[PDB]
Amino acid sequence: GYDRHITIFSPEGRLYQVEYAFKATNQTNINSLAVRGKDCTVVISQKKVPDKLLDPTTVSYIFCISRTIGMVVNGPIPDARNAALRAKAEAAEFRYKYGYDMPCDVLAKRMANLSQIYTQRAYMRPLGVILTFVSVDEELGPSIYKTDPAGYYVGYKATATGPKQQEITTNLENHFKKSKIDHINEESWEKVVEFAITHMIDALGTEFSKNDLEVGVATKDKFFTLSAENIEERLVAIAEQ
């Protein structure tokens, strides 16, 4: 049964190598979450540093692709960094060729098209990663676009990825049923980050120290990651309410 080893169709019209690449996604046992404010797009991810010998500052699954685009990865770090370098190079070339900054959704479509090729070409394996792209696009505004090993991509009001994704997803669905809107009706990014952590705590049912989390924030004309003390400042604010 070599139809399970390479990206050709099984008798039931399935690509097992694509399906198994999806299972590689959860290998890190990390859950990620993205939401949109009025002015910003916040992405948060769990940070598990099990080894005491690791330098914790170098353990990261959030990447600054361009000045405006950030990307969090669900999957092994080798494949994660492979995707990040290509995304950076693609976003840099786009700007040189076309004279304006690559939109989040266009970079998503391009990275998805590359992922699609690996599902059709035999010599290339899919990357065992799901890529969540975030920005505040100068045309579309706060934007979340997500890619998978199948080469699928779509825009989101909010999204979650990882082993306990379904719990976070329904938690967010139930909030947006209640609020009746497409986003977090909040002025400051600081409170949208607080919302993201609050709704992750409720869905996962765990408490977080400053070193258990990782936060990216996209605003107009820059995407930046938060320090341990920026997150600690945020954790204190939630606790005092």
Among 54, 89, 181, 236, binds other proteins (CB under 8 A): 54
- DSSP at 126: P
CB of 13 to other proteins, least distance (A): 3
Say how far apart CA 106 and CA 127 lie, in whole Å.
Answer: 19
DSSP 143-196: EEEEE-TT--EEEESEEEESTTHHHHHHHHHHHHHHH-SSS---SSHHHHHHHH
> Min. distance of Cβ 101 from other proteins in angstroms?
19
Query: Can residue 214 be called a binding residue for other proteins (CB under 8 A)?
Result: no
Phi, psi of 13 (to 5 degrees): 75, 35
Whose Cβ is closer to other proteins: residue 16's or residue 208's?
A: 16
Please name the residue that has the structure tokens 């994660």: 80
Stretch binding other proteins (CB under 8 A), from 66-74, 143-151, 196-204, 219-227:
143-151
Contact yes or no for 90/104 (Cβ under 8 A): no
Binding piece for other proteins, criterion CB under 8 A, among 154-162, 193-201, 213-221, 232-240: 154-162
Q: Is 181 in the site for other proteins (CB under 8 A)?
A: no
217 binds other proteins (CB under 8 A): no
Binding mask 68-87 for other proteins (x = CB under 8 A): --------xxxx-xx--x--
Q: Is 22 in the site for other proteins (CB under 8 A)?
A: yes
User: In this structure, what token pair is assigned to residue 204?
Assistant: 């996962």
- Residue 45's nearest CA partner among 134, 113, 126 is 134
Among candidate residues 155, 164, 224, the one with its CA nearest the CA of residue 193: 224
Residue numbers at the binding site for other proteins (CB under 8 A)? 2, 4-14, 16-17, 20-27, 52-55, 57-59, 76-79, 81-82, 85, 105, 109, 112-113, 115-117, 119-126, 128, 145, 150-152, 154-159, 169, 172-173, 176
